[PDB]
Design a protein around this ligand. Structure first.
Ligand SMILES: CC[C@H]1OC(=O)/C=C/[C@H](C)[C@@H](O[C@@H]2O[C@H](C)C[C@H](N(C)C)[C@H]2O)[C@@H](C)C[C@@H](C)C(=O)/C=C/C=C/[C@@H]1CO[C@@H]1O[C@H](C)[C@@H](O)[C@@H](OC)[C@H]1OC
Ligand SMILES: [Mg+2]
Ligand SMILES: [Mg+2]
Ligand SMILES: [Mg+2]
Ligand SMILES: [Mg+2]
Ligand SMILES: [Mg+2]
Ligand SMILES: [Mg+2]
Ligand SMILES: [Mg+2]
Ligand SMILES: [Mg+2]
Ligand SMILES: [Mg+2]
Ligand SMILES: [Mg+2]
Ligand SMILES: [Mg+2]
Ligand SMILES: [Mg+2]
Ligand SMILES: [Mg+2]
Ligand SMILES: [Mg+2]
Ligand SMILES: [Mg+2]
Ligand SMILES: [Mg+2]
Ligand SMILES: [Mg+2]
Ligand SMILES: [Mg+2]
Ligand SMILES: [Mg+2]
Ligand SMILES: [Mg+2]
Ligand SMILES: [Mg+2]
Ligand SMILES: [Mg+2]
Ligand SMILES: [Mg+2]
Ligand SMILES: [Mg+2]
Ligand SMILES: [Mg+2]
Ligand SMILES: [Mg+2]
Ligand SMILES: [Mg+2]
Ligand SMILES: [Mg+2]
Ligand SMILES: [Mg+2]
Ligand SMILES: [Mg+2]
Ligand SMILES: [Mg+2]
Ligand SMILES: [Mg+2]
Ligand SMILES: [Mg+2]
Ligand SMILES: [Mg+2]
Ligand SMILES: [Mg+2]
Ligand SMILES: [Mg+2]
Ligand SMILES: [Mg+2]
Ligand SMILES: [Mg+2]
Ligand SMILES: [Mg+2]
Ligand SMILES: [Mg+2]
Ligand SMILES: [Mg+2]
Ligand SMILES: [Mg+2]
Ligand SMILES: [Mg+2]
Ligand SMILES: [Mg+2]
Ligand SMILES: [Mg+2]
Ligand SMILES: [Mg+2]
Ligand SMILES: [Mg+2]
Ligand SMILES: [Mg+2]
Ligand SMILES: [Mg+2]
Ligand SMILES: [Mg+2]
Ligand SMILES: [Mg+2]
Ligand SMILES: [Mg+2]
Ligand SMILES: [Mg+2]
Ligand SMILES: [Mg+2]
Ligand SMILES: [Mg+2]
Ligand SMILES: [Mg+2]
Ligand SMILES: [Mg+2]
Ligand SMILES: [Mg+2]
Ligand SMILES: [Mg+2]
Ligand SMILES: [Mg+2]
Ligand SMILES: [Mg+2]
Ligand SMILES: [Mg+2]
Ligand SMILES: [Mg+2]
Ligand SMILES: [Mg+2]
Ligand SMILES: [Mg+2]
Ligand SMILES: [Mg+2]
Ligand SMILES: [Mg+2]
Ligand SMILES: [Mg+2]
Ligand SMILES: [Mg+2]
Ligand SMILES: [Mg+2]
Ligand SMILES: [Mg+2]
Ligand SMILES: [Mg+2]
Ligand SMILES: [Mg+2]
Ligand SMILES: [Mg+2]
Ligand SMILES: [Mg+2]
Ligand SMILES: [Mg+2]
Ligand SMILES: [Mg+2]
Ligand SMILES: [Mg+2]
Ligand SMILES: [Mg+2]
Ligand SMILES: [Mg+2]
Ligand SMILES: [Mg+2]
Ligand SMILES: [Mg+2]
Ligand SMILES: [Mg+2]
Ligand SMILES: [Mg+2]
Ligand SMILES: [Mg+2]
Ligand SMILES: [Mg+2]
Ligand SMILES: [Mg+2]
Ligand SMILES: [Mg+2]
Ligand SMILES: [Mg+2]
Ligand SMILES: [Mg+2]
Ligand SMILES: [Mg+2]
Ligand SMILES: [Mg+2]
Ligand SMILES: [Mg+2]
Ligand SMILES: [Mg+2]
Ligand SMILES: [Mg+2]
Ligand SMILES: [Mg+2]
Ligand SMILES: [Mg+2]
Ligand SMILES: [Mg+2]
Ligand SMILES: [Mg+2]
Ligand SMILES: [Mg+2]
Ligand SMILES: [Mg+2]
Ligand SMILES: [Mg+2]
Ligand SMILES: [Mg+2]
Ligand SMILES: [Mg+2]
Ligand SMILES: [Mg+2]
Ligand SMILES: [Mg+2]
Ligand SMILES: [Mg+2]
Ligand SMILES: [Mg+2]
Ligand SMILES: [Mg+2]
Ligand SMILES: [Mg+2]
Ligand SMILES: [Mg+2]
Ligand SMILES: [Mg+2]
Ligand SMILES: [Mg+2]
Ligand SMILES: [Mg+2]
Ligand SMILES: [Mg+2]
Ligand SMILES: [Mg+2]
Ligand SMILES: [Mg+2]
Ligand SMILES: [Mg+2]
Ligand SMILES: [Mg+2]
Ligand SMILES: [Mg+2]
Ligand SMILES: [Mg+2]
Ligand SMILES: [Mg+2]
Ligand SMILES: [Mg+2]
Ligand SMILES: [Mg+2]
Ligand SMILES: [Mg+2]
Ligand SMILES: [Mg+2]
Ligand SMILES: [Mg+2]
Ligand SMILES: [Mg+2]
Ligand SMILES: [Mg+2]
Ligand SMILES: [Mg+2]
Ligand SMILES: [Mg+2]
Ligand SMILES: [Mg+2]
Ligand SMILES: [Mg+2]
Ligand SMILES: [Mg+2]
Ligand SMILES: [Mg+2]
Ligand SMILES: [Mg+2]
Ligand SMILES: [Mg+2]
Ligand SMILES: [Mg+2]
Ligand SMILES: [Mg+2]
Length: 72
RNA sequence: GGAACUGAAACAUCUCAGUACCUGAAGGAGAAGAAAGAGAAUUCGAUUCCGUUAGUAGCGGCGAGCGAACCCGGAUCAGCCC
RNA sequence: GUGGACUUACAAGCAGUCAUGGCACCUUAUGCGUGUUAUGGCGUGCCUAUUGAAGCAUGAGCCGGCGACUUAGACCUGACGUGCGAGCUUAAGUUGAAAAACGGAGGCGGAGCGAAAGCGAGUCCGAAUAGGGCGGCAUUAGUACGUCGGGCUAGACUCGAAACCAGGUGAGCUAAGCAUGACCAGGUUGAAACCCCCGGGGGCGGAGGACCGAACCGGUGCCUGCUGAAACAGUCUCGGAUGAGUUGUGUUUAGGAGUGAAAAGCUAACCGAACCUGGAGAUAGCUAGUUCUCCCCGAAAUGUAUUGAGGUACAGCCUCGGAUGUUGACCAUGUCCUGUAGAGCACUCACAAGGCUAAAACCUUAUGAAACUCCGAAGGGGCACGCGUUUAGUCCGGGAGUGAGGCUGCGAGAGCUAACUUCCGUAGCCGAGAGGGAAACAACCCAGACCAUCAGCUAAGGUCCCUAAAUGAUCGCUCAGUGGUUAAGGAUGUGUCGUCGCAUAGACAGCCAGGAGGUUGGCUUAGAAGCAGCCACCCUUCAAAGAGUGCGUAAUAGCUCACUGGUCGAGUGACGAUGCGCCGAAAAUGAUCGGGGCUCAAGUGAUCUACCGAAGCUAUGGAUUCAACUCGGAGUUGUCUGGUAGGGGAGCGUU
RNA sequence: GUGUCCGAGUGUCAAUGCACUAAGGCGCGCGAGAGAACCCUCGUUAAGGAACUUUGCAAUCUCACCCCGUAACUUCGGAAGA
RNA sequence: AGUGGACGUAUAGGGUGUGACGCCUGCCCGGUGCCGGAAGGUCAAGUGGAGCGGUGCAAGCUGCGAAAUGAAGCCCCGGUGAACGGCGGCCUAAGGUAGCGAAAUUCCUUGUCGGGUAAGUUCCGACCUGCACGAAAGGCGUAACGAUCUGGGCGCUGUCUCAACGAGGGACUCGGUGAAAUUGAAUUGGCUGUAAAGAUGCGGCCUACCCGUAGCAGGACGAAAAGACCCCGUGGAGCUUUACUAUAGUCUGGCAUUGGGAUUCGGGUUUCUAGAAACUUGGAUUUCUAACCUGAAAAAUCACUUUCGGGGACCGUGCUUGGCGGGUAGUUUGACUGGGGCGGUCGCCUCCCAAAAUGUAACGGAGGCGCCCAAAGGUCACCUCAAGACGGUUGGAAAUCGUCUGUAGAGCGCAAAGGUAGAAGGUGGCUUGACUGCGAGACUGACACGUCGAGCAGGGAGGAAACUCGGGCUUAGUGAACCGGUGGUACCGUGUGGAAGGGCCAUCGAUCAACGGAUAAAAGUUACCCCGGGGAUAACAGGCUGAUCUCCCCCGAGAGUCCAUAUCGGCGGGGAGGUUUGGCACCUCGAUGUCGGCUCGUCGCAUCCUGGGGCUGAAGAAGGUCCCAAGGGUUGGGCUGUUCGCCCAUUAAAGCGGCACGCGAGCUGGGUUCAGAACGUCGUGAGACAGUUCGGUCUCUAUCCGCUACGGGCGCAGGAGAAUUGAGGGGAGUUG
RNA sequence: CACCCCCGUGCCCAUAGCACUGUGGAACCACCCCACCCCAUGCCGAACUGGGUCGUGAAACACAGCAGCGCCAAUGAUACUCGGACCGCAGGGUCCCGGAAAAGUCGGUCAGCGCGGGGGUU
């Protein structure tokens, strides 16, 4: 063994209560650990970036049912 | 005739360098010199030396690095003979 | 070395430091004196290299004197200063020189974008519109010098290679050759050939890389010699000693070359490539060394990359200046994100007793999990505020160094739940840190040294003597020197509670009294009969006794026992929690808690004071760094001043 | 260390060997005491005899000439100074 | 040029290896070498120049440029071993002929038996199981020879038990001369602790009047040479080869020196009734003598002439071609690494570690990638998976159909984590958005790279539309830079116009996988080693730890007929000691000498003897085992360098360990570890192994402390002679 | 939001879901109804789908009861932990302050809010 692979510094890049420019990246994820609410659009590797400038808010009933909206 | 350390963080091309060194000829100097040229204005008008153009052009395992010439400004300026 | 003051012969000692006393002296000098001295306290040379230095790590005998960050250039870059300023200035040279002027060729600013053609405050990409660099805007003014910080290139802070190359010098040592001369006492052995008697005997003869042994040539073994008598020898012993011998002279062969009966041996006393001069101050990522003083700030041993790992590049951290202007920082509120501790089996692996059944499955019950999660804190990170105390931050430009870390505690891995082990996270100390405590001691506990005082309160730690300070006070605890070195395990050790029995209808040991019944009980080997031993315990006679405890020879008896009794006269026996202790408990020169000594506490657990105790804090005096505040550095108030690499600043000494 | 030449006598089979000595030459350019440990070159050693030690390393022992006598083996010479 | 070979000429000369003599010298031509062959494969310059292009109005000039034809040489085919070699592993070209064998070769190894000694790791003779013999890198013998090595025996010895006495030269004392290595400074003790972990110098405690002198050799990690061992340096040098690169040399084709001619000519021209005389441009054999080379004659080397003689247009030399070329030369030969080597690893992806942010090391625990898919894409539309039970045709535990349960227990191309049921899974229709030009904004990184990305243009594709498309559910499927190939484009293109060449856009070439990548192009070896450094880093020793080692204790199964504990103690548990093999890497690489012996010793006690005990399965005696006990004592020899162990023969007994595995400024020097050499084994080679074997320099001068002796001074309240008490210190201590 | 009830479509986002179950009927919805063709089944008008009444509330669906199941879930007490401060050689553990789960019990629920329309009491 003695093998390993680079860190992928994934996360909630922008936490609810953070104003965001358009195109800011807010969550990094392997998949849909977050499912993108209103105003946000999710990319190829399933990072989801805000489309509209404003505050970031978490809709989060959880269990795969967590969504990131942006409010203007 | 012609190095090698060395640099290239190794090392062959490269550089170190036509350096050091050996050998020949000669003088108070020597060399060179009177355009089958530079050059791009149909200009220049022998040779040598300084400043500059200029680290420009360019050369380079296009790497380390190596590097002009013309224009222009001065020092000195004689062209003579087969 | 000579002479004089003071001193020195039970003293333990980085050579001193402060203090006190004794003696001597009085020319910056009768003092807050100079020389010396006794005693007391205190006290790990210096530098370097270091995680860490008194080190038993390096360097150094001592004093002097030489001795290391330079110079260069029409170079690049920055800070400061000066002239001129939208412009600024020369170079080569020329003419003068006890003096400098002329000299515009040329350089820099003025426009940028593009790969370039080329356009031009626009420009490249492109088919038009999205960008990049750029001007407007802040038009940030440049340039010639001087000084200085850096950079470059050249020996480039100084010393130091082993090597490489060039042209020479060497065969007078030694390695061989050639020419030519010379030397080898003496004794032993007796080949051929030649000649007689029958290959053999005799004679005769004088051969040999033959024998012994002097010179001579050579070095076999011990010893001596080992700052030698000698830079390879000496005594003694040994090899050869007519041969492949020794030796003179003259002479030839040499540097990757010669010579070599072959060791890489010899080539002028260091030959796996001589010597000398030179290239040449070769290179040196390696070592050591780098000197005057004071002020201010102050690190790093981390990340990634590397023919990289002990070295470099770029970040990270330091400093100086400019700008900005609280953006910092801690703490609080609000919010969001997380899958650890824990905890759980709901999936995956595992796994514990059963029921159920052609056992997978299934149910009751029961568990572990870094790569399991139905769950899931504490904390932690981002944002916003400041609803609150503070002073840092950000970018831009010059200079750095650091890129070897060390411990402890917490959390993990690796290891053996070893290591003053190795590798990460994290906090603090050390590095770079002085002062008090811990006998001693970078890391631990206390506490960050501006200077001066024969002033005060305290921290940790202490208060019997060493040794500063209560032989303090009160309730105990341990009689072990435990204190002042572990454990599994044992113990009628001792206090504190605490759970279970049987007693003035009289029990525990304690003395006499009885020990019974089938039954010499079934089941066993050869006999096993309270009393080897696998299987099973009911029944009679009794105020009274279990087919019944350990012993006994191999089996029964035998003295005791569990209930019974006259006596006996009052508590006992059991497992338990614990507090302090005992054993368990052997290592190497001589013992010990730092020592004395401590229970007639100087141990201990609980409380409470009173004081000692630091370079921390307070007092008086004093000076720097900064900043405000005033007058044309000064002074006030506040504040700050441990320090390695390093950066900055003010100054002293020499020619 | 250094090449060549001459290098007497007594005795001893011989000799340039060994011992004494002629000629000739010299006592080695600090001395004098003293008679410890220890060290170097030496002499003798009870009893034992290799026990020593890596090894009999070293030190003994053997010693010249003459007579007698000498093996396994042999390349017929030698081993043999058995 | 000239020389040596050689004033020699195959019975001679050169090289290579074996190494008198004797009997001998087997197998294997596959690779490598070499010698022959030379049907065919390939192969340079040169001869040829068909065609492809520029540039000019054109003549023409000019850049490329095939086919065929071109030597040696290599591929191919034989052979060669007294050529390099090979003759073994429960198919290779073959597999060991004789001879020998525990060897100079034997690891296991002190092999087994015999011999010799009281005792034999040695030695000798047999045996053979030859790790890992062997036939001219020669095998088996051999008389004689050896300062050769090994084993034995005689002889004699101070080698020794065990040393003594004597001599001389030192050594000591006096007078004369009078150095040296060294040296931080010294007012320089013992223990025990502590500190970088070995203290004179830090702590406590003990001891110690001042100073010498003769001695010793424990300490001062004493002295000496900035470790020759080990590691490091993008140090060096010597040596090696099928590392790389060149190259003296060497072979080969063509051109010149270099020529007439006959002879066969694939061909040239004007020549003539498909044709041949003048003639060749050449090639080819063959031949010739004026070039040239060489030799003989009074004129030695050289020149002349030569009645001359031989070779001969070759040989030699100049240029150029291609091959051979460790002989020479200049170099390359990676890093991490709980010391180097060996093994492993080097880039990207997934998980745990990673301590609920991101991040985080390890030669830590697990596994994947160097691709795929014309549809596994875009879009539009449509389906729902495991698994179980009941029932069923050839099948039955599981084909297939049928019902019931069925937030998933399936699937998602490969590894896993996330994710997913309104799909990313499955199945069709259409087509390519697997587009060109851009990139607001962020994530991430020191850079450089990397990730995601709304929306705009041109234009597509699917859908009725909203809308979705600039690749795949996601995360791996990858390499800057240089130098070049291919297609466009029309920017530079040196006087001008063109073109040659260059630039740009697209694309191709990389286990450069040591994966940020030194060159286009590179392996070993050093023990002949050299330099510079490192205690940054191994071998020793000390330290820390104590797995392993040594010891004790608890339990108690059983053994002990019986009876656990007289003894012994399974399977398990707890400690101690630091003597073993270690780990770790802390002081020491400007030096800490290392194994064994010898000489001196001293300490522990886990006690071999001796002394005092308890229990005993103790009658007695001899024992067993445990307790207390460290005063003393603990033998001599054979084997091996040994420690050890075995053995002889005795003992009261033949103790175990510490003290740098105590002791080399005390001694040896056998072992091991420098240069020579040989054997086996490994390597083609230089060379190599902690396998073996012979051999191989151990440095007169003691300052200090410390130790044994011997004085000087002073002290001890007068100055003196002599006798003394013993504080307190040593020696002795055994036993049959 | 007059009272109910139906069809649909949201918010919510198992305290709403399952099962047992009962009411429902031409009003709404639902099956049945037929198929050459629109349109379709990798076979079937089962599914889409196109043409409709009867019939029937069977099934599905809506709505009520329902605490067997699931779903939620205290308090209390712990586990753990931020800071402080300690002991044990060690594995380990204690104390002060404050934050504080998970599991279980107690107990809670078969929901809760809109919007448009259709038909009822005519
Ligand atoms: C004193 C006797 C000899 O001693 C020696 O040969 C002594 C040498 C000593 C022992 C050596 O040092 C040791 O080196 C070991 C590798 C390590 C060791 N310890 C510390 C770990 C260390 O001690 C040598 C190499 C050390 C130094 C001093 C050195 O190189 C000495 C050279 C000269 C020494 C001496 C020289 O002897 C020469 O011998 C010739 C035979 C004589 O003729 C003569 O030559 C002229 C003589 O001198 C050179
Ligand atoms: Mg591993
Ligand atoms: Mg270089
Ligand atoms: Mg070079
Ligand atoms: Mg010159
Ligand atoms: Mg000259
Ligand atoms: Mg001249
Ligand atoms: Mg006194
Ligand atoms: Mg003293
Ligand atoms: Mg100090
Ligand atoms: Mg160190
Ligand atoms: Mg020192
Ligand atoms: Mg020294
Ligand atoms: Mg110039
Ligand atoms: Mg300025
Ligand atoms: Mg701008
Ligand atoms: Mg300037
Ligand atoms: Mg500076
Ligand atoms: Mg700079
Ligand atoms: Mg130098
Ligand atoms: Mg002879
Ligand atoms: Mg003889
Ligand atoms: Mg010799
Ligand atoms: Mg002899
Ligand atoms: Mg030289
Ligand atoms: Mg050579
Ligand atoms: Mg020499
Ligand atoms: Mg140079
Ligand atoms: Mg480094
Ligand atoms: Mg930097
Ligand atoms: Mg900020
Ligand atoms: Mg703030
Ligand atoms: Mg857990
Ligand atoms: Mg965290
Ligand atoms: Mg605000
Ligand atoms: Mg800067
Ligand atoms: Mg580091
Ligand atoms: Mg660290
Ligand atoms: Mg472990
Ligand atoms: Mg450590
Ligand atoms: Mg370490
Ligand atoms: Mg440091
Ligand atoms: Mg600090
Ligand atoms: Mg301190
Ligand atoms: Mg202490
Ligand atoms: Mg102290
Ligand atoms: Mg220290
Ligand atoms: Mg300190
Ligand atoms: Mg420490
Ligand atoms: Mg404290
Ligand atoms: Mg006080
Ligand atoms: Mg206090
Ligand atoms: Mg006191
Ligand atoms: Mg206990
Ligand atoms: Mg008291
Ligand atoms: Mg007080
Ligand atoms: Mg104080
Ligand atoms: Mg102060
Ligand atoms: Mg003042
Ligand atoms: Mg400071
Ligand atoms: Mg301070
Ligand atoms: Mg300071
Ligand atoms: Mg004579
Ligand atoms: Mg005579
Ligand atoms: Mg005589
Ligand atoms: Mg004589
Ligand atoms: Mg004389
Ligand atoms: Mg004399
Ligand atoms: Mg002697
Ligand atoms: Mg004797
Ligand atoms: Mg005898
Ligand atoms: Mg012996
Ligand atoms: Mg012997
Ligand atoms: Mg020997
Ligand atoms: Mg001898
Ligand atoms: Mg015979
Ligand atoms: Mg005979
Ligand atoms: Mg004889
Ligand atoms: Mg040979
Ligand atoms: Mg043997
Ligand atoms: Mg042998
Ligand atoms: Mg042999
Ligand atoms: Mg034997
Ligand atoms: Mg034998
Ligand atoms: Mg052979
Ligand atoms: Mg031989
Ligand atoms: Mg002989
Ligand atoms: Mg010989
Ligand atoms: Mg012998
Ligand atoms: Mg004597
Ligand atoms: Mg004497
Ligand atoms: Mg004297
Ligand atoms: Mg004199
Ligand atoms: Mg200690
Ligand atoms: Mg220590
Ligand atoms: Mg002391
Ligand atoms: Mg001191
Ligand atoms: Mg001595
Ligand atoms: Mg060194
Ligand atoms: Mg060295
Ligand atoms: Mg090299
Ligand atoms: Mg050639
Ligand atoms: Mg060629
Ligand atoms: Mg070579
Ligand atoms: Mg390495
Ligand atoms: Mg994390
Ligand atoms: Mg780290
Ligand atoms: Mg799909
Ligand atoms: Mg888009
Ligand atoms: Mg579009
Ligand atoms: Mg359409
Ligand atoms: Mg092209
Ligand atoms: Mg490359
Ligand atoms: Mg790399
Ligand atoms: Mg040598
Ligand atoms: Mg050092
Ligand atoms: Mg170390
Ligand atoms: Mg060691
Ligand atoms: Mg060892
Ligand atoms: Mg030293
Ligand atoms: Mg030394
Ligand atoms: Mg004892
Ligand atoms: Mg006894
Ligand atoms: Mg007895
Ligand atoms: Mg003893
Ligand atoms: Mg001992
Ligand atoms: Mg040891
Ligand atoms: Mg030793
Ligand atoms: Mg030896
Ligand atoms: Mg071989
Ligand atoms: Mg031997
Ligand atoms: Mg001596
Ligand atoms: Mg002497
Ligand atoms: Mg008195
Ligand atoms: Mg006494
Ligand atoms: Mg005394
Ligand atoms: Mg609660
Ligand atoms: Mg708190
Ligand atoms: Mg805490
Ligand atoms: Mg709490």
């Amino acid at each position: 063994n003695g093998r390993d692979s680079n860190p992928k510094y994934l996360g909630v890049k922008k936490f609810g209560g953070e104003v965001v420019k358009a195109g800011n990246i807010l969550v990094r994820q392997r998949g849909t650990k977050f499912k993108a609410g209103q105003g946000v659009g999710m990319g190829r590797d399933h990072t989801l970036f805000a489309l509209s400038d404003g505050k970031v808010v978490f809709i989060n009933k959880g269990k795969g049912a967590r969504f990131i909206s942006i409010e203007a």
